[PDB]
Symmetry: C5
Subunit: 307 residues, 5 copies
């Protein structure tokens, strides 16, 4: 095969969309291989810019196509340089930009720890005609700098693997496996905004719904529970544009569900307390002892849910 070396530079990572589970990466790509020696004007290396490289392509120069596997839509490419050293090596420098997608788990919403994946693979040649030797990723711009709500940590891990595509086996008998470069950038979500925007106001609404039991009569605390129901519905709205639809439950949605359960349990408990009077003579305080036991059990439920 023809040995190809890749050097991916990353300019910035921006536009992290946690709802669509995509992110947008800017930077440059530098491929480099070795071919037959050629003649260039003078000892200086030759530069071929964009919209004129096609003359060299039709002239007979072997130039591979690099595509990104996990991209959404076409990569919005810009400039492309094909510079030619006269000793033989051909360097293809291009600027890439596109929306990349990943699995992006959400088992813990506010304290999330994710990774950003770039997968690079030639479109045409299998690994017996183009093998990737190595990649060095220079993430010097975003090495320890904070992007939106994400605090990037560590270097970018590199890997080379041989992926196999079975759909090409109808036309290629044996040699139909492709060279993979995957580039991983670990990213940890910064939980501060969520900490002072959702989990603390929801806990305070939980305490306000706890404080229903301190009342003295029926209709006043039913109206208190109903106007607490309305504001729990209000916080049920604000999470609709913060995470997508998930099969499981995150921290915030479990807290919403716990709030609904606590308020309707309080309403059912007060309804049962009023229903305890068979003839309208019995006082209702014996079941009203959960002023100092419902918060303890709810705290225990939260403590179990933490671990």
């Amino acid at each position: 095969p023809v040995d190809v070396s890749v050097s991916i530079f990353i300019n910035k990572i921006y536009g992290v969309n946690t709802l669509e589970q995509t992110y947008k990466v800017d930077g440059y790509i530098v491929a480099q291989w070795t071919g037959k020696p050629r003649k260039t004007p003078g000892d200086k290396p030759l530069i071929v810019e964009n919209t004129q490289i096609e003359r060299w392509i039709n002239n007979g120069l072997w130039v591979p196509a690099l595509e990104f596997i996990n991209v959404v839509g076409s990569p919005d490419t810009g400039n492309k340089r094909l510079m030619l050293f006269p000793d033989g090596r051909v360097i293809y420098n291009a600027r890439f930009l596109g929306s990349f997608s990943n699995d992006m788990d959400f088992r813990l919403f506010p304290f999330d720890r994710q990774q950003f994946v770039l997968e690079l693979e030639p479109f045409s040649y299998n690994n017996q005609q183009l093998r990737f030797s190595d990649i060095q990723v220079y993430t010097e711009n975003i090495d320890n700098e904070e992007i939106d709500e994400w605090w990037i940590r560590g270097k970018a891990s590199t890997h080379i693997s041989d992926i196999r595509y079975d759909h090409l086996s109808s036309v290629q008998p044996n040699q139909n496996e492709f060279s993979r470069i995957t580039v991983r950038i670990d990213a940890v979500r910064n939980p501060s905004y969520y900490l002072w925007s959702f989990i603390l106001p929801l806990g305070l609404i939980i305490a306000a719904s706890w404080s229903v039991f301190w009342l003295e009569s029926f209709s006043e605390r039913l109206q208190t529970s109903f106007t607490l129901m309305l504001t729990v519905v209000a916080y049920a709205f604000y999470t609709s544009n913060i995470l997508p639809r998930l099969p499981y439950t995150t921290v915030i949605d479990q807290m919403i569900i716990a709030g609904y359960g606590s308020i309707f349990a309080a309403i059912l408990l007060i309804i049962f307390a009023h229903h305890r009077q068979a003839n309208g003579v019995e006082d209702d305080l014996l079941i009203q002892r959960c002023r100092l036991a419902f918060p303890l059990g709810f705290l225990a439920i939260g403590c179990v849910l933490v671990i």
Copy 2:
């Protein structure tokens, strides 16, 4: 005709839009036919990449156009390989991406069972000049993996049919029918998020509206019913961005309508109960027996609506 074999590979299915009734599919398409034997440099097959295939097209090579019938907009094509074996067969490999639309019924919203359809058809040649022999679809990437809220099950069924277009009969006398490939991927919606987001809170609001009848006087339970009306209006909003406009009623909208009917029936029943006093001496408890009969009838209504 010229026999053409298709092998569609599917990379991922993403961006399922249940409101616009479209979905976006990434993957590759591999067409293959057989032509006259040709001379290639060496015994190796020849590779022609993108933006240089037009030289072979103007040079005189017969290369069909594959279009997707059910696509929204132009398919955002990327790379395209035309590789040439020297024995005669010509292989057209291309990467396709676009928004496909389907009928996408919504008789049951949270427990939906849909399918994803890809329809492939040549743009120019009728079946007497291009007949599709077979298709093998390799859905190995999404075979049993979960995409957003959709849990994909089974393989992808394949079919070949001859569709007929009457609009072309003005220029072609008899032979004006086209070759169809349809590819079907069955998909079942995962009902968990809806189960703990809409149907359970709405049932709890239904029980809260049931609990109006336990009060003792007029204005307190009218205010209770009105503040329950307000939060049913609040849940009437949250469904406005979850399904499109439908002629029929789904489960969730029938539950909204049932909630409105139950609350206004309670208000009318209490209004009638107060209106029962002709001279202000009659007690109002005889019609107030629906504390243990309105939930039973409402449960029966729900049970009828289930089947």
Copy 3:
């Protein structure tokens, strides 16, 4: 002139945007005229596909440009076939897709009856050098099938007219009028979703605002009227993303205005009833007789507004 025949096929009509007053139409266009006899390889007709037709255009072939007058943006064209019979006729087949706009009246919102208009006109030649003979529109796909909330009825009416453009009269002395094809598809809005989403809940809120008059004291029914005011404001929001800004009033906005008028009339009537006491001794029941007259007058107002 050169006689041109058009056969427009319509694949589907989708993405009906009632706010922007545009709609998106997919399908094919087939133009056909007659020219000088030519020589083709063999007795079979010649096929010229996309991205190679420009060789025949620069070679000297007369091929008109068909544009859509009422389009928003450029029509997102795809494939284009120029097939050549050897007897002389030249057929230009193209696939068109774009957002078309129309007047789209809204005098009755839920029971709307609209039409979809496609206007076709050559860009360059006036009717003395290109005259449209006839059009046959094959709307076989959407002939009696329901698209989103629109139930399409009937065939598509056809017309040929000669439109005149005065702006071209500065450069052409007399012959400056163009050939028009307009294609009309009548469409009736299906009122079911609106019937069980807006007009019925609003009428029930109207009845709830009627039920204010059954109370016995002041502040309780003022609070009842205010919490009904809040939910009428809540329904004033839901119509903000269903129709655009109109100079006139539809059914639903007239019902909103009637709800505001009824609630504030009830508040003013109760304020006047309390203000009737000059010295705090007079009872307030004489003006409170509108329990059985305000619904009758409001029903009469609705009955007048219907016709």
Copy 4:
């Protein structure tokens, strides 16, 4: 210089975005100058269509570039005709579409009177090599027809001026000033929808907040004022998607601010009235005389704000 005459035809003006302060204009542009006499096939004028004009451009024909100065993004051009009379004049007909921006003042929101501006200017040649002689604008399609909420009045005024660009003075010593065509279409906003959607419901909320003073005790009218506060907050939302952020205040936002001021002034006045009792014996009616003076002063404030 070379004298150029322009005839701009306007098809429709649509998509008026009052938030982004842009609007979208469809129509055609017709440039015309005079050059050397040429030979054409026959006495008929020659027509050159799109995607073949570049042969005449590379062949040596002088064809200027017309750009729109106030455009947002590139103008989405479509067809372009370059027709050649054999006497010498060369006519460049093109179809233009793009988002144009203007200052778009908002001192009076519902009774706005704006204008739509098209600025046309050559990209390359200064006025000593291309001078615009005149423009005639044919606004016959939208001459007295209503677009969305805008009622277009009058003709379109025309102007020719010589704009000067200082940034080009580094490379051109003296002659560096360009020819301007500005085309102005006056447009008056139709205030009906706003009249029955915002200013009337807000005045009715103002009257409802006036009616707090008719109560007899404390907590009932505090709760009345608070539930009026909530619905004034509700109307504070609906204006967030109707106008952009402005440094000044429009009519509707001044009415919101007046509503907040009136409600909190009522709350402070009632708080002061309750605080007037030093020992709990004094009656609170002397300061409660603003039942018939607060509306008069508020009407006077509105009357001052009108002029």
Copy 5:
């Protein structure tokens, strides 16, 4: 190297998106260098327009590529002029438009003071083959004019620096550092709309939550605090589309948090006041002295938060 002079003209700055932290800049770019003397038709300088410059590029003319480093997506370029003086200098004039991004700090939201940065850098040549001599930026259009909510002050500062890219060091041994032009436009946010839209209504809600303590009994002031809680939740929504997610807290979000803290502190204080009665005989006024001390402490907290 080849000395290049740049003159950037700025037409307007529009579409400032404070959520995505990007802004869109229109204007022109004028590059200029000096090459070998050439022959042109006549003594006049030669003009080469768009879509014909590629003939001169393939003909052998050295023309650099100018890219913007901090751009989001490809710059939506339009026309491009390459004018040739016959003495030797070659001028490349182009029109640029794109979304540029910057750090855009938000430590003070309503009284923000930001800057707009344009970074220009050649794509291919390092500073030993293309060195930027100077830039003069002509910001004459937006010199002291107000764009949306931003009041632009001062001139645009200019700078030339030599940036170094390590990712290119794999292919270039020593000389791998690029020439930077950065152009800075200082911009101050106009705080008026925020002043009368958020900070004043929130302070008035704060005073309304202060006025809870003037009541006489329990359930009335609990209901007052709960209906104030609901409208603080309502203002918690309106800030969700005004700034993005930030790790820190701005002025408005600190005011929201202070409002939540004050209301729940009032609820806890009243709960403690009711809980002070061990046997139901003690009066609750001793802890109710914060009618004139809670506003003072809250004002002190605000005063500390200001500096």
